[PDB]
């Protein structure tokens, strides 16, 4: 079939119930591990290194049934464990940072968005799982950029992972991917 190929695909792109160190270099994981670390040396001593440790996918607050009746979106929240290294001092600053809500894929390919049963057709040759992961990379690449900028024009001492990170660019990129998803006819 396709749904079964497609479902698993997305399901491996998120690795959502896989313990962080049993996680393969795929989809988001790659996206994150590849796009991070963001360093600004540039000041002779230090500036900062911001490294990625892990990501957490929340578990769904509403079930598919609840979601289709109560007209809600079927999505888990995404968090990233970020860490700011002052090499000027050695000081480290950890933080779980909120990166937005990921839609979960129900058993038949469809997503549930605000009660509605919506599908991302692959037209094709790059499955739904890698289609998302690809667009995820772009967002992150933009988010990776708000940080590089703030580091340059903030006081390192008052900077912290949560302040450097702006999720908007990541979300804008997701909204657009899941925005042009279509309604299902089963």
């Amino acid at each position: 079939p396709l749904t079964e190929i497609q479902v698993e695909s997305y399901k491996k792109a998120l690795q959502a119930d896989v313990p962080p160190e049993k996680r393969e270099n795929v989809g988001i994981q790659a996206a994150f591990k590849e796009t991070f670390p963001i360093e600004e040396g540039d000041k002779g001593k230090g500036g900062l290194v911001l490294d990625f440790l892990e990501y957490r996918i929340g578990d769904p607050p509403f079930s598919q049934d609840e979601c289709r009746e109560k007209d809600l979106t079927y999505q888990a929240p995404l968090y990233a464990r970020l860490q700011l290294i002052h090499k000027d001092t050695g000081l480290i600053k950890e933080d779980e940072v909120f990166l937005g809500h990921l839609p979960l894929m129900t058993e038949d390919g469809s997503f549930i968005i605000n009660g509605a049963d919506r599908v991302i057709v692959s037209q094709g040759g790059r499955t739904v799982g890698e289609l998302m992961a690809d667009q995820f990379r772009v967002g992150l690449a933009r988010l990776a950029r708000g940080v590089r900028e703030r580091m340059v024009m903030g006081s390192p001492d008052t900077l912290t992972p949560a302040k450097l990170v702006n999720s908007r660019p990541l979300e804008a990129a997701l909204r657009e991917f899941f925005s042009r998803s279509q309604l299902s006819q089963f």
Binding site: V49, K87, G90, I92, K93, E94, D95
Partner: protein
Amino acid sequence: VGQYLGLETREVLGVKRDYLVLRYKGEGKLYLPVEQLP
């Protein structure tokens, strides 16, 4: 208000360093190296 959450042997910048691990109430988990004075 800083809460002292003990010492910890973390490896960063490619290798070990111990830090004094503090959670400032308000939230950050601050890791402060033993090599420094304060």
